[PDB]
Amino acid sequence: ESADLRALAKHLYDSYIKSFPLTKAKARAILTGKTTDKSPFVIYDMNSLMMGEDKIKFKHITPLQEQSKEVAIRIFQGCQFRSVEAVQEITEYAKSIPGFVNLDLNDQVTLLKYGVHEIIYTMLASLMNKDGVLISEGQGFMTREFLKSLRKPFGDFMEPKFEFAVKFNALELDDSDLAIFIAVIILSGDRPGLLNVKPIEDIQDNLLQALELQLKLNHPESSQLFAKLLQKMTDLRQIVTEHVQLLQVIKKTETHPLLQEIY
Amino acid sequence: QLNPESADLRALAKHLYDSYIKSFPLTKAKARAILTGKTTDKSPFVIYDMNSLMMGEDKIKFKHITPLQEQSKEVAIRIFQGCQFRSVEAVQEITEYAKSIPGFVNLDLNDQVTLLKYGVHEIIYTMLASLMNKDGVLISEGQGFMTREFLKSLRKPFGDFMEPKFEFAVKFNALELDDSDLAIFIAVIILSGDRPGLLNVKPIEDIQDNLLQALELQLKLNHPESSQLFAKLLQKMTDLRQIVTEHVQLLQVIKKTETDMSLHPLLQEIYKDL
Ligand SMILES: *C(/C=C\C/C=C\C/C=C\CCCC(=O)O)=C\C(=O)CCCCC
Ligand SMILES: *C(/C=C\C/C=C\C/C=C\CCCC(=O)O)=C\C(=O)CCCCC
Numbered sequence: 001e002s003a004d005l006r007a008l009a010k011h012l013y014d015s016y017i018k019s020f021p022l023t024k025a026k027a028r029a030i031l032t033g034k035t036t037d038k039s040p041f042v043i044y045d046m047n048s049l050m051m052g053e054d055k056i057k058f059k060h061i062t063p064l065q066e067q068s069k070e071v072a073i074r075i076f077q078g079c080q081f082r083s084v085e086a087v088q089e090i091t092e093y094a095k096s097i098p099g100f101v102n103l104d105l106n107d108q109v110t111l112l113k114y115g116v117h118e119i120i121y122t123m124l125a126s127l128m129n130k131d132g133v134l135i136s137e138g139q140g141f142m143t144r145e146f147l148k149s150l151r152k153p154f155g156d157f158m159e160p161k162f163e164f165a166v167k168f169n170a171l172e173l174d175d176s177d178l179a180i181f182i183a184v185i186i187l188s189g190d191r192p193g194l195l196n197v198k199p200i201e202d203i204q205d206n207l208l209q210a211l212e213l214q215l216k217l218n219h220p221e222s223s224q225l226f227a228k229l230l231q232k233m234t235d236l237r238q239i240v241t242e243h244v245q246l247l248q249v250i251k252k253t254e255t256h257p258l259l260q261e262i263y
Numbered sequence: 264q265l266n267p268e269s270a271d272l273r274a275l276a277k278h279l280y281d282s283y284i285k286s287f288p289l290t291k292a293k294a295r296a297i298l299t300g301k302t303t304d305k306s307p308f309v310i311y312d313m314n315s316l317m318m319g320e321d322k323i324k325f326k327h328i329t330p331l332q333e334q335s336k337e338v339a340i341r342i343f344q345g346c347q348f349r350s351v352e353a354v355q356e357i358t359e360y361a362k363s364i365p366g367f368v369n370l371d372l373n374d375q376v377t378l379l380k381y382g383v384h385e386i387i388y389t390m391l392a393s394l395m396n397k398d399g400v401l402i403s404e405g406q407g408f409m410t411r412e413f414l415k416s417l418r419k420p421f422g423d424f425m426e427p428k429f430e431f432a433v434k435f436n437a438l439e440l441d442d443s444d445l446a447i448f449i450a451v452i453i454l455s456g457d458r459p460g461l462l463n464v465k466p467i468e469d470i471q472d473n474l475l476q477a478l479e480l481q482l483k484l485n486h487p488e489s490s491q492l493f494a495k496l497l498q499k500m501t502d503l504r505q506i507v508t509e510h511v512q513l514l515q516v517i518k519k520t521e522t523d524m525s526l527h528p529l530l531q532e533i534y535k536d537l
Pocket of ligand 2: 328342343345346347349350353387388390391400401402403404405409425
């Protein structure tokens with residue numbers, strides 16, 4: 001079956017690329033410099049952001065003129081809108097995972113409900129380095145020091161991620177690897193309220209086998225990578241529950257009803 | 264078949280399984296024999312209520328596991344006090360165990376302490392699974408058995424300390440692990456590398472890297488028909504962190520509701536900044 005574990009890896013990879021525009025391969029090229037030629041607009045401070053508004057014109061999120069006056073908030077609000085796009089990108093990838101659409105409908109919903117955050121932060125790592133994060137289709141780059149530079153909880157929000165991203169990218173995984181890995185996270189059998197755990201585990205098991213092989217063939221060198229990677233799943237839960245803490249803590253900062261409802 | 268390389272990992276597994284038995288009086292194998300009734304001499308006194316509770320000291324010898332205290336208006340607290348001191352003991356044991364882990368004492372003195380600082384709880388709840396079943400847990404070295412229900416009816420705060428534990432025991436006990444698997448597993452947990460403060464990480468990782476190898480071989484060798492038990496086992500680590508944290512949160516409250524309740528210094532030197 002070690003040609004069945006290599007077919008499923010490929011399919012996932014091929015789907016991973018068909019559902020996600022900005023890839024680890026890409027994002028990584030940008031960040032550094034390596035043959036690209038069109039540098040990103042660096043948001044490093046106030047005039048940077050405001051100029052970034054009509055440059056990368058990330059006025060997809062920025063509009064809804066009932067803001068503009070509250071930097072820290074228009075930024076976090078930005079992540080909101082962005083994360084929502086990702087979620088649709090994730091759902092689509094989900095349906096690519098063999099067996100996923102065959103499960104009970106409620107379970108797919110539940111699996112996705114409890115997995116997006118973990119999947120968002122994992123990929124968010126591909127788009128950041130020790131000094132900053134890539135924004136809007138990788139057009140820009142929002143420095144890291146500028147994010148702490150935000151007042152209330154708005155400067156503790158991203159910093160945790162940075163610490164995670166650092167440990168995560170240290171694994172030096174690529175898109176081939178992350179595709180399968182993302183699949184594993186989704187097929188989590190301990191999501192509360194599931195209905196039929198057996199099918200899901202059977203799938204995650206097939207995924208775990210595929211992910212192990214992927215790691216061996218792709219990183220003969222790196223020992224027990226498989227293990228080190230599964231362990232990071234712990235860091236995601238924490239990063240997440242924690243992130244979801246501020247979401248509450250930060251309900252004390254005056255912040256259309258349609259839009260709220262869209263989130 | 265068996266090769267040079269793999270042979271090194273077998274000696275390692277056997278070395279640790281051997282240190283583990285020598286550091287823990289109540290192995291899982293014994294706990295199970297006690298629990299699954301395969302005995303007429305290993306039967307524990309069951310506690311599911313105050314009367315049973317009262318009878319308890321009147322059977323399951325209690326040299327005051329809940330030291331210095333003829334009593335205390337609350338059983339819930341008297342229990343808590345026992346539970347506390349017991350943990351104090353498990354730390355001591357886990358500690359004797361650690362020292363025997365190849366390379367562990369050869370590390371920076373401070374790191375050794377940070378590994379233990381965080382490793383203790385995670386390890387304590389793993390071992391605590393061994394003493395449980397959906398219905399309760401063993402106490403006093405297997406001599407007694409306190410039901411899940413009793414514990415769950417204790418009182419406002421305290422009636423919330425064990426549930427999360429039973430929660431994990433049921434799922435974890437499902438992997439069907441035995442003492443020899445747990446010894447290597449308990450060893451991996453200690454040799455993390457991402458513990459808050461670890462001055463020198465790398466060396467800690469070369470050790471773990473190896474323990475994982477032992478665990479991987481051990482598991483396959485001991486569960487041939489158990490698909491990805493290795494990975495399924497590693498994921499359970501994420502379950503442990505939550506238990507731990509859920510616990511700390513828990514203590515904190517107690518520290519205000521009951522200003523008369525004391526905590527072991529050692530136990531506090533763990534929690535302080537967790
Ligand atoms: C946003 C905060 C958390 C993560 C939310 C969304 C990230 C979404 C997708 C990751 C990339 C997936 C891919 O490459 O396809 C942090 C920010 O990025 C800052 C938002 C700034 C917007 C103005
Ligand atoms: C402690 C959980 C239960 C303790 C129950 C009753 C305590 C009363 C007497 C104990 C007798 C001594 C003995 O049990 O040997 C849960 C924890 O917080 C972690 C403890 C882990 C135990 C290994």
